[PDB]
């Protein structure tokens, strides 16, 4: 799609804006076990580099000598790498939060101080008398909300991957 | 800004889809008192109409007789109305959830059945011995993440309002 690649630049920009927004939203203090996408700090640099790539693709659209043509291919390749990584980690963390956890990555020190007596990955009270209690309903709401965050991030990352794959297939 | 009206429509429809995603994200069952922005279903029709307006601004871009030129002004005016409305609901609901509740609107029947024994607007335990307990930390995390969603939705609505106000400034 070489017709309005400028619009795809704005697509990448908006995707970076929402990626950094979701990254900031993920670090709300909840449990000492942060999501696997949070401790790796993927959303921050992912959105920053998405913004960089969109700015590069939607700045001049002319035949620059070295500053743009030479760097466009490497930025696009890095974008594909980052997008496939984001997809992989998102669909891995979905199973991590829905199925039994198989990596236990600790949260950041400054965010875990506020809520150090809480966990979110597993919550089945040792006392079955609390099954119909707000203590478990709150954790269920936390898990559902986090899964929604993961799903929206995953679908947006997949769309970004498709768009940048189209950009690369345009530029051999 | 008349140089790139095609990309402005893409930005508008991206903002609309982000609003739709946030609205669907806020429908997770948490407390019988749903946020004021959800019980009125503002994100649904608002986002759909942002889609429509942005698509209209970035479909033809030619001198159409009646389909495009005549409807563009009314679509933009409706966009400004909905954007200022969304700003008003966001500013109201932030103080609703963070300071005190002054408009109490119940959640939908089909979503409140899953979690009917839980509340998030005023969660201060009646027994002070539970202050340092996960039962309050869970609600604190719920409130913090809801406030974050409200803030990001507010900033997206404000940016979209600015963009569409500039568009109306272009088209007297």
């Amino acid at each position: 799609f070489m017709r309005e690649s400028k619009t795809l630049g704005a697509v990448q920009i908006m995707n970076g804006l929402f990626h950094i927004a979701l990254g900031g939203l993920l670090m709300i203090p909840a449990g000492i076990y942060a999501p696997i996408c949070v401790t790796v700090w993927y959303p921050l640099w992912g959105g920053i580099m998405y913004i960089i790539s969109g700015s590069l693709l939607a700045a001049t659209e002319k035949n620059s000598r070295k500053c743009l043509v030479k760097g466009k291919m490497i930025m696009n390749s890095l974008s594909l790498f980052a997008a496939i990584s984001g997809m992989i980690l998102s669909i891995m963390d979905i199973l991590n939060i829905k199925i039994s956890h198989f990596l236990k990555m600790e949260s950041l020190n400054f965010i875990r101080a506020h809520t150090p007596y809480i966990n979110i990955y597993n919550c089945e009270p040792a006392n079955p008398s609390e099954k119909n209690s707000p203590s478990t309903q709150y954790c269920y709401s936390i898990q559902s909300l986090f899964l929604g965050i993961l799903s929206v991030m995953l679908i947006f990352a997949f769309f970004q991957e498709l768009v940048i794959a189209g950009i690369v297939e345009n530029e051999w | 800004f008349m140089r790139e009206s095609k990309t402005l429509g893409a930005v508008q429809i991206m903002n609309g889809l982000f609003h739709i995603a946030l609205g669907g994200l806020l429908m997770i069952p948490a407390g019988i008192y749903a946020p004021i922005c959800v019980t009125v279903w503002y994100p649904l029709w608002g986002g759909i109409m942002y889609i429509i307006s942005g698509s209209l601004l970035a479909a033809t871009e030619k001198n159409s007789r009646k389909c495009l030129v005549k409807g563009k002004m009314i679509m933009n005016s409706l966009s400004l109305f909905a954007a200022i409305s969304g700003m008003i609901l966001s500013i109201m609901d932030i103080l609703n959830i963070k300071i005190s509740h002054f408009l109490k609107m119940e959640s939908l029947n089909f979503i409140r059945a899953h979690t009917p024994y839980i509340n998030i607007y005023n969660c201060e335990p009646a027994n002070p011995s539970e202050k340092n307990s996960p039962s309050t930390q869970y609600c604190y995390s719920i409130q913090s993440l809801f406030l974050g969603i409200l803030s990001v939705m507010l900033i997206f609505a404000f940016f979209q309002e600015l963009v569409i106000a500039g568009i109306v400034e272009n088209e007297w």
């Epitope: 000492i32 007596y117 597993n122 079955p128 008398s129 | 996960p134």
Partner: antibody
Amino acid sequence: QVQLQQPGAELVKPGASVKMSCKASGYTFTSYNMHWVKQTPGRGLEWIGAIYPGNGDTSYNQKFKGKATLTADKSSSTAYMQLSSLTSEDSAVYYCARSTYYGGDWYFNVWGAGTTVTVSA
Amino acid sequence: QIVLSQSPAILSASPGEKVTMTCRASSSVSYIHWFQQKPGSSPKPWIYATSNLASGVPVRFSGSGSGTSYSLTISRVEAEDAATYYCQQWTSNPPTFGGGTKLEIKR
């Protein structure tokens, strides 16, 4: 006056099934929980699960989720723990201790005598 | 699952002398519980809520500590306390007991 009564001990052949008993008296059997623990000298004392006689709900752990099952009845005010697939490495002491929300968190008010199971042919 | 480790595994304390044992955890548990057991007997509860004392306890014992580190303090240890002390928590499912400090009389 609150106390929990448990049988002394019994012998179980490997691969068989055994049922535990823990009779409660002096307090409401329905209201309080029926936590069970297992103590082994080699690896210390570890949790095995719990059962609520009020609603019949049971909770376990992923380590021994299917090894043991819990079933209690409010008619006799007794809780029954059934073990499946006995193994020679399952020769330890099983305790029956109730749990109460005392002092601001869950606390084991009283314990039981415990059964010293033996798995040998 | 939260693992609890306490050191030393075995310590010897002279009668009528202050002795302190520590129980650290891999996570900041909200509260800690201390239990002691005697040979051929069930582990009787000893300390609850990290600051209070169970019924039938000598006044000498006094548990304290906050955060990820908790310690047990004995004003005057005697031969009557020749048992093993267990560290227990209730923050995360499932609760995990400690290793055990076997008190020894050093005369």
